[PDB]
From a paper:
The mature capsid comprises 60 copies of each of four proteins: VP1-4 (with molecular weights of 25, 25, 22 and 11 kDa respectively for ERAV). To investigate how similar ERAV and FMDV are in terms of structure and to probe further the cell entry mechanism for aphthoviruses we have determined crystal structures of ERAV at two different pHs, using highly optimised methods since the yield of purified virus was very low.
Crystals grown at neutral pH only yielded poor, incomplete data to 3.5 Å but possessed 120-fold non-crystallographic symmetry. Averaging rendered the electron density clear, delineated differences on the inside of the capsid compared to the low pH structure, and confirmed that there were no major changes elsewhere in the particle. A structure–based phylogenetic tree constructed from similarities between the biological protomers of picornaviruses indicates that ERAV is most similar to FMDV. In contrast the surface profile for ERAV extends to an outer radius of 159 Å at a prominent crown around the five-fold axis built from the extended VP1 loops (Mengo virus has an outer radius of 164 Å). Residues 14–27 form a hairpin contributing to an extended β-sheet which stabilizes the pentamer interface. The similarity between the two structures extends to the calcium ions bound on the icosahedral 3-fold axes (liganded by Asp 195 and Thr 194 of VP3) in both the low pH and native particles. Similarly, there are no alterations in the ERAV pores between the low-pH and native structures to support their involvement in the exit of the genome.
Residue numbers in the entry:
A (entry chain 4), B (entry chain 4), C (entry chain 4): 16 to 36
D (entry chain 1): 1 to 246
E (entry chain 1): 100 to 197
F (entry chain 1): 198 to 246
G (entry chain 1): 1 to 99
H (entry chain 2), I (entry chain 2): 12 to 230
J (entry chain 3): 1 to 226
K (entry chain 3): 58 to 226
The structure:
Amino acid sequence: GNSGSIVQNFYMQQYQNSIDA
Amino acid sequence: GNSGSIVQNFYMQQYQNSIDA
Amino acid sequence: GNSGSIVQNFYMQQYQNSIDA
Amino acid sequence: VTNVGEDGEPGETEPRHALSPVDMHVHTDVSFLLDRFFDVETLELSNLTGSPATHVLDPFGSTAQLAWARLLNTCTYFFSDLELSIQFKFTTTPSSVGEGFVWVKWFPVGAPTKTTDAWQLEGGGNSVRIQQLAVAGMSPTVVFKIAGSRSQACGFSVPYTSMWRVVPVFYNGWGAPTKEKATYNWLPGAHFGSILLTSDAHDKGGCYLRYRFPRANMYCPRPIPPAFTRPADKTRHKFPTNINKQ
Amino acid sequence: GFVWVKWFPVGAPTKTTDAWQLEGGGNSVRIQQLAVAGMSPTVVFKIAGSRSQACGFSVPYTSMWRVVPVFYNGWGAPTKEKATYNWLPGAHFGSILL
Amino acid sequence: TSDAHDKGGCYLRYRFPRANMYCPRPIPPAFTRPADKTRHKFPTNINKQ
Amino acid sequence: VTNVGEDGEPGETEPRHALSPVDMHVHTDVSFLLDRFFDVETLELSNLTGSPATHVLDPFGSTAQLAWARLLNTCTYFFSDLELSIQFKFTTTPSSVGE
Amino acid sequence: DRIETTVVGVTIINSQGSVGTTYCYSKPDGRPPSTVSDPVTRLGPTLSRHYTFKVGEWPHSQSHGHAWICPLPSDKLKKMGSFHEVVKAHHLVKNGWDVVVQVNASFAHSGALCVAAVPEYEHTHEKALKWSELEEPAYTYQQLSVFPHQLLNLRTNSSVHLVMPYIGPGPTTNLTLHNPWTIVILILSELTGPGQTVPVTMSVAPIDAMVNGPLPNPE
Amino acid sequence: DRIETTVVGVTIINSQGSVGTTYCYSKPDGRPPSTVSDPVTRLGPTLSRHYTFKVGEWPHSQSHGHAWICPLPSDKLKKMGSFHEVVKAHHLVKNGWDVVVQVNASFAHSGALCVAAVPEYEHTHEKALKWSELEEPAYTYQQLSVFPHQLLNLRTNSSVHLVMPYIGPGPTTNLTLHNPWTIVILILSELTGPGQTVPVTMSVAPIDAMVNGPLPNPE
Amino acid sequence: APIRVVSVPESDSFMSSVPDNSTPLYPKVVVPPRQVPGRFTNFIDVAKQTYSFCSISGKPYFEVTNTSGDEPLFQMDVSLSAAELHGTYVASLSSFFAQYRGSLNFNFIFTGAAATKAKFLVAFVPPHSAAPKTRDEAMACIHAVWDVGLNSAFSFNVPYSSPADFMAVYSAEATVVNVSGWLQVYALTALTSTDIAVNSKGRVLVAVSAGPDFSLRHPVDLPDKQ
Amino acid sequence: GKPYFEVTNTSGDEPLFQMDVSLSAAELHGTYVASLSSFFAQYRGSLNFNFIFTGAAATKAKFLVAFVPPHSAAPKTRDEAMACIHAVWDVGLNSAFSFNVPYSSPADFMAVYSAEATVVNVSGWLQVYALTALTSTDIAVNSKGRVLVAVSAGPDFSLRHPVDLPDKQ
């Protein structure tokens, strides 16, 4: 979704968002 | 711990923190 | 010496400092 | 084509030279359309002193049809993270708060409340109090000034708090064993949390909350609410557009 | 001075009366209904101390036409009217509400 | 030290990275005792109304 | 289960369909919960002139239970670095110090 | 042939009228709750059979919009006489349904119904869980065809075989407080023909019933 | 160690006191009735758990012969609150039992009980199925040791773990009319010691429950 | 040592659609699984695999008597805000946007007595004239004829034909891009019944399924309520 | 005000111990496991309790525990409670006991903070009963027996979400 910049992962996806299982 | 950004090591870990042995 | 950041060499060592021989 | 209708399932016809795609449907993608800071809600901050009204980020209410309201109530259950962006429209002479710190503190589903005084900043006399639960700690605080700040706003991530495997929009049942008029479509905490705004301001300005719903997952479709009256039969409805005539 | 620059794509509706309102201690200042944030990209910039009271962004090609015709010889609507000659429905890039 | 000293305070803060803890200890209640048999009721996000 | 208690060591029971984990305990992790700027203390600065009262960063005192106080006194010994962030709430008319 | 014999328990519903077996959203799952470290009972084949409630009696001048609200199944649960008794003394229940609406008509009858299975049906004015006669806001009929259904048309049949799976926000639920699956029946086109009634009907029935831990004697 | 933890359902009876697990006659069988071309329900693990009735309060001067009649389980069925509800609406039930008598005593106590599981227990003066205090004709104690049992002796323990299989003349039966397994408790040697009570107790529980075809709503 | 940068004039401004999130203030929040079926990623998806009753007169159906013939039976200006296509899913979805590019389908569920037959005609009139008002005028266009009796409903695909690659999800004064035309149905054979007595009229449902090439592009805020 | 209940040879019907299974219910107030909790907002665990009987070594008490899921309004006699999930235990040679109050509810996480009756606050009650009134060498020497109620965190239990502390109440 609307996040097409190569800086979005400055904060790795754990801090960024959530996680399912 | 709460530092999940890929800029935390701008200052290498010597200046950043301490060291044990 | 007290420069443990990975940006110190933005200015290459010629402009940065001096040189000996 | 001869349709043997009645058993739900639609029915198509397919002409000749069927038309090629383009656009790829894409602009109708749920997660995508919902990943953008909307202007929803708008409140009044707190004075540092006294007791607060813990604001709650429950964007599943709708009404003023700003095309974000309907869209959320097109699904039954919804699961997405959140992200906010408070701003603060000055309400009078924008030069009466020479500082305005604003203790935006977010809280996760279930966090306690009761916030009376407990902090106090001592300095030469006077001393200005801060709200007990407002200070910094466990649940993320943001301190921004309301003076000279070329954008009296902030903004951050807020991963999905609520206990429910997914957020039910419209609940048919009740929220507590006290089958009471209120707890019908309530359900304990079908939401994203709260926020407590305290600043030496409170008056002389509002806010404009905002939501960025990344990772929006929607389930169980529902009917989509018209949003416009019915016209005069046989004809078109005419809204002044980019296009139009003149 | 907040300025609600909101861009609109070829075809977006219009009619924008009040519907928003920011409540705070009294007074309360309204914002334009379609002005708020949402579907079509808003930008809020201050007109005070701002070392450049300006903004700026991308706006990909909206219009329906495979290409934009500059000078049209025909008309824009079945109402062959003096105006719709070199008009053609929306030979453009959109709108903006400030 | 600053030409200030008055006309303002501060709010110190601590970020305790690399926190290592040893030798557990008991954790202090922080809330009075309620009325026996029952629940304690703090106004939450949830709550009833 | 029959417990032969008294010798410290707890005692469990384990039901049927034991429940699957999620969250992973994680949010209870010591180092993690403590790696965040808390609002602790608050003082008054010095005039440049005269003699000072050297402030000391001893955050092992507790009392006002702002869930950071208790947490530090859950352990016996503690070793961690520190990082600070002074802010400064103006106490009067925020336009009297032009510097 | 339109043989529509559907069995669950030992209640064999034969009924011609059915045209299709509409599964709503999905097939039901028997895999115990994710969040109940608690011992369950997989209710047997007897009990979780069927029941069959005469719904109401369709009339004539009933302007498109009228429906038979059926929050499945509270208020009408007290009549599922063996299953009923069980969910009384057991906190929570994970169960989908099976239902076969049926209607008694002829040759000279116009009138069609959009009978649909609604997930988290809104409405029922805090007088919910109460099967009855509330209208809907009109358009609900223009769009009620979006919530998995099957219509009934007197010019083609007499049944609608809605078969649904378990639903609720949490992985299971208190069926004395949360009715996920609530069935409706809206009149798309008024009824027309001979002056006799046109009685409506419906054969409700739980499926894959599992109810957790028992509750204190009612004494 | 005399660890005697017995589980059925999710009622975990731990009790030291038990010394032995006495199976009466045989092990119970789950193979449906020979004579019921009728669909059954294998009652689940919840429900068919245990229940636990305080039996009575043993006294002192009670001359050998007194017993606690326990036609398992009618009159005291109305308290097995989830299983109870089921056998109401289901003609016949094929089920053995499990029961653990228990008694609260000490060091200074004489008195022993021949607690036994009786098949087709005679007696209960057409006021049967009624748990109570009828005496027996004396010799019944000289011979009550012939019907599979386990005694209780205050000088060695506090339980008797009688575990029985299904019985009745026909291959299954109406438990509201025919109690095959009826437990008794006779005082072989009077009670003697400190003046306190000596309360008796018992943890009853169905096993392998299967009840045939449902019955009309009670309305 | 210190990097050299330059802020754009814009800089410290908002942006209500910045392709990139914000600062993650809470982290590591693992989230529980979801077992609910009937989920969706795309909205077009739901309106394609689902019809919705068009609102003719105040009802979702027209009549068929044995006294019709010439007269039109149903007519409406094929544009996603024309009366009939007002209450439909497919049309109500549309208004979150600004453009569509699809041919639509309609299904005619005849509900008259099972002793009734009606036979019939549908017709699509591309934009030009001013609404033909008799089949004799309309049949000279693209039309389909259908005979209820054993069918038990019918389907007609109103295609997409126009010079523009996308049209308007919003109707307005006559443009080459608003109107795609009309949709019409006719009494090619006035209804019949066992007895004119028992069976007066027959009816027919007008359900709207999104076409197979149909799509909405461009999200847009909602104007005023009118 | 103590960490234990009694057992006399005059009990029987009456409940022995009861409390609304929620991490701020009276009994579970002073416990480690409960006091830890308040740095947070949520828990998802079944708890365990251990019953350390401390009466004379010439005392026997026999007994019953029971977990009452939320519904009724507190059964008040074992005859009412035994129809739920319960365990019976006989002190004499054991020298204590353990009971695991599970987790059963529609929500994947509950509230570490109690409040007005919600479907998510209350997980129910925990009850223990006199399935057999206590006994002693002499009613003289040994009046009452006691029993310790120790709370071990369950094996599937976890706290999620840190939260500042409200006011002190």
